[PDB]
Amino acid sequence: YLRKFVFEWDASEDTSIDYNPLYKERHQVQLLGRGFIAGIDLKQQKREQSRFYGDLMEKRRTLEEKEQEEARLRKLRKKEAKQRWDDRHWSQKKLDEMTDRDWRIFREDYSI
Amino acid sequence: PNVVFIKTEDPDLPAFYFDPLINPISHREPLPDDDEEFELPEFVEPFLKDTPLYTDNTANGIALLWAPRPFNLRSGRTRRALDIPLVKNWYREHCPAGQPVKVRV
Amino acid sequence: YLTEHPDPNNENIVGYNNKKCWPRDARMRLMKHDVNLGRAVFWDIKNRLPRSVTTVQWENSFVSVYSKDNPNLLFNMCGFECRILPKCRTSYEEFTHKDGVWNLQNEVTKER
Amino acid sequence: MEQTLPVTVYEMDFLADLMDNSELIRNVTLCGHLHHGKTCFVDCLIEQTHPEIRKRYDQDLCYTDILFTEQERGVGIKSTPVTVVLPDTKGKSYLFNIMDTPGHVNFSDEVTAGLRISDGVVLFIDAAEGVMLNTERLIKHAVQERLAVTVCINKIDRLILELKLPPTDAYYKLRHIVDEVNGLISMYSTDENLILSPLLGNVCFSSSQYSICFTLGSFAKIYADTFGDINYQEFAKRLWGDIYFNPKTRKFTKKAPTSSSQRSFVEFILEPLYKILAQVVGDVDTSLPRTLDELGIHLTKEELKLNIRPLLRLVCKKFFGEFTGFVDMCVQHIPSPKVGAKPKIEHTYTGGVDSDLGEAMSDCDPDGPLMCHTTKMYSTDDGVQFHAFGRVLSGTIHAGQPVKVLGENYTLEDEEDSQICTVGRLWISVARYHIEVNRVPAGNWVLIEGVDQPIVKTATITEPRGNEEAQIFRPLKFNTTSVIKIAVEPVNPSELPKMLDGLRKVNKSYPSLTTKVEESGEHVILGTGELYLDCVMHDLRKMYSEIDIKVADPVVTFCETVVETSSLKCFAETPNKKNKITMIAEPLEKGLAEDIENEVVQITWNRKKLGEFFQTKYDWDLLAARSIWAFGPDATGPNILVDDTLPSEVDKALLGSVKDSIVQGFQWGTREGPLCDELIRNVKFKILDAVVAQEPLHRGGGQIIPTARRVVYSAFLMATPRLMEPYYFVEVQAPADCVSAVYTVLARRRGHVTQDAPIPGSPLYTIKAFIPAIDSFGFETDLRTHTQGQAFSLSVFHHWQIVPGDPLDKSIVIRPLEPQPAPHLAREFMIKTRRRKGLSEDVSISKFFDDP
């Protein structure tokens, strides 16, 4: 009411320096607890999500629905644990379980 | 209008299923008298009574309805590998809340 | 003035000379009545002078009005841009001694 | 006439022939909430009746919403009339006049313009969102305008492709929507004759995106076509309402067999629809041909290669065919101009049905006296000339015919607000093209040309040298009140006249717009919201006046009131030093002003009934209930003028001589008000004493009107004055998680959340709130930005609430540019407005008195 070849941008060119709390801390999207932002790790997004919809399901789901979801989560976690157990670190890989890719990972990941 | 498409997580569940996300509806008519002589001919049945209500690949199609543009289609024209920006939608959206100053710029 | 130079569109403000050196709250505020009065005064002065003898251009002149709407009285004299602000008018503050400020006081009462 | 027109299924001669017969005409207003599918439904009808016009595979073509601003925003802004010839279920073609109204609440006034020239209302309700704020407001307004009401439950496909509800749950959702609409109607209408239920045919289920329009009768006729032996009317009677079907006995019974069979609606209607949609969207390549053959629909190879949405639209167009269910619904339940003329005259015509001309118009005869009534003003593409749009109630309007146009102030005693104009041309108004016609009989909509000059908002077209007792139609009563006030000036004052012209034009384009000039020479525009004023200013900048215009920040129009009686009996004499009037002012009872505004009480009533009402509902004294003079500034104004002068002290006959002058002064004073020149609201004025000069020449006229205004001002000021902010009602459709965040936004704008109930059958919640209008600027933007766009809000004027501060508090110091704290907001709102109006710096309590 009142030269220089710069490869990286300058920090003064930044925007989004707001004073309104409604605009600084913007409430992220919770796509019904089932949609995730692209690129980011799915497990990280699951861990850091607001967990509001998990409470909503645990409050609204019937006993049979709870059993169904528990069984599905059991199977999915079993598959994930199999993948993790299979994905043993090259050194962690058992002597006999060290394949050619595991030996290459042990040779490359080590400092020697 | 807010698309209220409920994404299905459990494939075993029926395609047309009352997901807990949907708010349950609190239940509670000049009807004709039952004693009347209305009869339905034997040739008459529901239009697709034999047709199953849902199939194993029905929820997949309903999900494909609301997919991003390259997946909303079923027929299309081939594009150059140059012409496809794999990460254009990434910076077209809002920057993630916790990020350093250089990535925001 | 408006009988001789009518202004149905209130266009008298478009060409009003004002001292841009001072800040906006320090300049003359182009109120409708103040602008009309300044134009009327300049018009009367110009009419008092025959055009062949001498001419008083509006673009090279400057009229400043002090009234209930304008607290600052501005004038340029001998290279000095002076702006008088009365004490009882839009001061409401304790004043120190600044070099560029002249403390004008009434002679008969010696009051600033 | 003869001109170039687009290819259509019917013929223009048939359309003109249908206009003569008033028994085959339906005047229909398609109203509803924002983005509920009205425009897409009209587009589907146009595609049905225009073979050459086809909707794009990607972009939902909108035949209505022709404005550039409408196209860019995507929000309907102005009502679009469309006259078509639609086939019924039996095949009988009916003439349909459809006024596609905008769904946004800010443009609710537009819908009012479409409700004056219509006999029936079709309310479009989203099958997913259900009943929203604008649907309730439009139901109240329609049933209060004495209009037939039907419902189209649009976007049923959202129940199938978005919510993925089970068919029984979809039936439950539809039944709940119908029940809620019925409850709203019964709440706003004393009569219970107009119960809405799909059994009666009042309700049609539609999906304008995929062209799935059907009622029970139409879909039962589909069954009759595929199986000839069944009678469709009885089947449609049996299709809805928890009536189960037994295929062992082939009979419909209220008792459910097998305890697992679905209702008739679910088994026969909903489940086949689900199967069709699921086969198209899920099993297209593997199992679509079999179901297409079972339904008798044959699609070409090029047609089967379409994407899923175009394929759904094509399949459902081939299956359901024409929108005959909509035609049934609007033919059986919406009166024709012949049938529906009597309620329209009884409600809108000022002279009433009892008058001779009212009886003449009750027949809607083409060969009668001309009584056309236009409520819209449509600007041409160039924006220079305006066409007055409205229905012809009697007689017949002819092109090139002399006409008497009556304005809103035209009366029999004062006929000055009337002008003789020559009609230029007549058009039947389809959306994107106009059919020039030589004449238009009674009961049809017309774009009269050449009559725009003497009218701003509302017109009464009649014939000259006749109808010497003709009166005007009542001006449009508006659903909401225009509050948001913006000052407008030109960038270059040299081009001031152009803007002025533009103002006139916008005053014609927007029915509720109010443009004036205050005492300070400031041009003032009143609107209903920020989107409404945005559209108004876009029109003012681009369509009408092409000049650059500066717009002040938006402020609201405050009201003035009192909270306790006057300290002393105020008084004033005339400049003649005679005719002393002594008055006091007191606040009204709770809800009395609401009763006056909502037409619950009218000064047009006789003394007996008005006194009885004021004595029983508000327990007034008989003398106090019979001494009431006038209601506020306008007709049914929130203020009340009473005289407590006992006949012993003041002659009632003498006071009645100056009664008109005193009432005029009261009305003017209440319209202006002494605080900041704003409407005085909810104040009772009592005339304690009245001396009156006996000679007529020393009273009346300019002596007693200003004296009455002065004494009203003094009585208002001595009584403790207060300001009323306008409080808007806000409905937010937000996801479950975002509800909390919504509160945060309303925390920063003095917003009070009244309720946060969820939407049954939908994963969203409707947060209702009461936000100050002065604090509502940018609230919609703040809410949508803070919640990443997932929360949407619509604000509409709700009431007037007293500002916390005290306006007459000279002790308060106010910095020029600072958001003042609440305890003295009124003090900020009074002086600053006083500066905007151009009045003095401050008002004194004894300014209008006689002692000082």
From Swiss-Prot, chain A:
It is found in: Nucleus; Chromosome. It comes from the Eukaryota. In vitro phosphorylated by CLK1 and U1 snRNP-associated protein kinase. Phosphorylated by SRPK2 and this phosphorylation is required for its association with the tri-snRNP (U4/U6-U5 tri-small nuclear ribonucleoproteins) and subsequent spliceosomal B complex formation. May be phosphorylated by SRPK2 on Ser residues in the SR domain; the phosphorylation is required for the removal of inappropriate R-loops during transcription. Coiled coil: none annotated. The phosphorylated form (by SRPK2) is a component of the U4/U6-U5 tri-snRNP complex composed of the U4, U6 and U5 snRNAs and at least PRPF3, PRPF4, PRPF6, PRPF8, PRPF31, SNRNP200, TXNL4A, WDR57, SNRNP40, DDX23, CD2BP2, PPIH, SNU13, EFTUD2, SART1 and USP39. Identified in the spliceosome C complex. Interacts with ERBB4. Interacts with ERCC6. Belongs to the DEAD box helicase family. DDX23/PRP28 subfamily. Involved in pre-mRNA splicing and its phosphorylated form (by SRPK2) is required for spliceosomal B complex formation. Independently of its spliceosome formation function, required for the suppression of incorrect R-loops formed during transcription; R-loops are composed of a DNA:RNA hybrid and the associated non-template single-stranded DNA. This is Probable ATP-dependent RNA helicase DDX23. It comes from Homo sapiens. The lineage of its organism: Eukaryota, Metazoa, Chordata, Craniata, Vertebrata. The gene is DDX23. The chain holds residues 254 to 379 of 820 of the full protein.
Curated annotation (Swiss-Prot), chain C:
Widely expressed. This is Pre-mRNA-processing-splicing factor 8. The MPN (JAB/Mov34) domain mediates interaction with TSSC4 and SNRNP200. Has structural similarity with deubiquitinating enzymes, but lacks the residues that would bind the catalytic metal ion. Plays a role in pre-mRNA splicing as core component of precatalytic, catalytic and postcatalytic spliceosomal complexes, both of the predominant U2-type spliceosome and the minor U12-type spliceosome. Functions as a scaffold that mediates the ordered assembly of spliceosomal proteins and snRNAs. Required for the assembly of the U4/U6-U5 tri-snRNP complex, a building block of the spliceosome. Functions as a scaffold that positions spliceosomal U2, U5 and U6 snRNAs at splice sites on pre-mRNA substrates, so that splicing can occur. Interacts with both the 5' and the 3' splice site. Disulfide bonds: none annotated. Part of the U5 snRNP complex. Component of the U4/U6-U5 tri-snRNP complex composed of the U4, U6 and U5 snRNAs and at least PRPF3, PRPF4, PRPF6, PRPF8, PRPF31, SNRNP200, TXNL4A, SNRNP40, DDX23, CD2BP2, PPIH, SNU13, EFTUD2, SART1 and USP39. Component of the U5.U4atac/U6atac snRNP complexes in U12-dependent spliceosomes. Within the minor spliceosome, which acts on U12-type introns, interacts with PPIL2 and RBM48. Core component of U2-type precatalytic, catalytic and postcatalytic spliceosomal complexes. Found in a mRNA splicing-dependent exon junction complex (EJC) with SRRM1. It is found in: Nucleus; Nucleus speckle. The chain holds residues 1113 to 1224 of 2335 of the full protein.
Swiss-Prot record, chain D:
InterPro entries: EFG_II (IPR041095), EFG_III/V (IPR035647), EFG_V-like (IPR000640), EFTu-like_2 (IPR004161), EFTUD2_N (IPR031950), P-loop_NTPase (IPR027417), Ribosomal_Su5_D2-typ_SF (IPR020568), Ribsml_uS5_D2-typ_fold_subgr (IPR014721). SMART domains: EFG_C, EFG_IV. CDD domains: eEF2_C_snRNP (cd04098), EF2_II_snRNP (cd04090), EF2_IV_snRNP (cd01683), snRNP_III (cd16264), Snu114p (cd04167). GO terms for biological process: cellular response to xenobiotic stimulus; mRNA splicing, via spliceosome; response to cocaine. The keyword Endoplasmic reticulum does not apply. Keywords: Acetylation, Disease variant, GTP-binding, Intellectual disability, Isopeptide bond, mRNA processing, mRNA splicing, Nucleotide-binding, Nucleus, Phosphoprotein, Spliceosome, Ubl conjugation. Residues 23-305 form the tr-type G domain. Disulfide bonds: none annotated. It is found in: Nucleus. GO terms for molecular function: GTP binding; GTPase activity; RNA binding; U5 snRNA binding. It comes from the Eukaryota. GTP binds at residues 32-39, 100-104, 154-157. GO terms for cellular component: Cajal body; catalytic step 2 spliceosome; cytosol; intracellular membrane-bounded organelle; membrane; nuclear speck; nucleoplasm; nucleus. It is linked to Mandibulofacial dysostosis with microcephaly: A rare syndrome characterized by progressive microcephaly, midface and malar hypoplasia, micrognathia, microtia, dysplastic ears, preauricular skin tags, significant developmental delay, and speech delay. Many patients have major sequelae, including choanal atresia that results in respiratory difficulties, conductive hearing loss, and cleft palate. Belongs to the TRAFAC class translation factor GTPase superfamily. Classic translation factor GTPase family. EF-G/EF-2 subfamily. This is 116 kDa U5 small nuclear ribonucleoprotein component. It comes from Homo sapiens (Human). The lineage of its organism: Eukaryota, Metazoa, Chordata, Craniata, Vertebrata. The gene is EFTUD2.
